[PDB]
């Protein structure tokens, strides 16, 4: 489904990736990357996570019908990362 980019990133010392999320099922909007802070894992990873990117999969899980809070919990769920890297399948826009 469309052009998809597979992104892998390890969190910092505070367990942060340096990116912001907007949208979700409850918000009636898609899960979009609203901000990417400079010099953070989301900014330094290759391929890069960009602003406006639509999150499709989080560690292989389909988040289409999930709420904003559920999406946040999935991102923070360190045990679901293989192997210690957060996997994100995104659609650039």
């Amino acid at each position: 489904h469309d052009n998809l980019v597979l992104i892998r990133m390890k969190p910092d010392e505070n367990g942060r990736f340096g990116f912001n999320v907007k949208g979700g099922y409850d918000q009636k909007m898609p899960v979009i990357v609203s901000r990417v802070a400079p010099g953070t894992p989301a900014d330094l990873c290759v391929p890069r996570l960009n602003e406006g990117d639509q999150v499709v999969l989080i560690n292989g899980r389909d988040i289409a019908e999930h709420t904003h809070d559920q999406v946040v919990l999935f991102i923070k769920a360190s045990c679901e990362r293989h192997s210690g890297e957060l996997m994100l399948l995104v659609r650039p826009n």
């Binding site: 990736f17 912001n20 999320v21 923070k76």
Partner: peptide
């Protein structure tokens, strides 16, 4: 318009 820093 909920926004969360992760």
């Amino acid at each position: 318009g909920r926004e969360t820093e992760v």
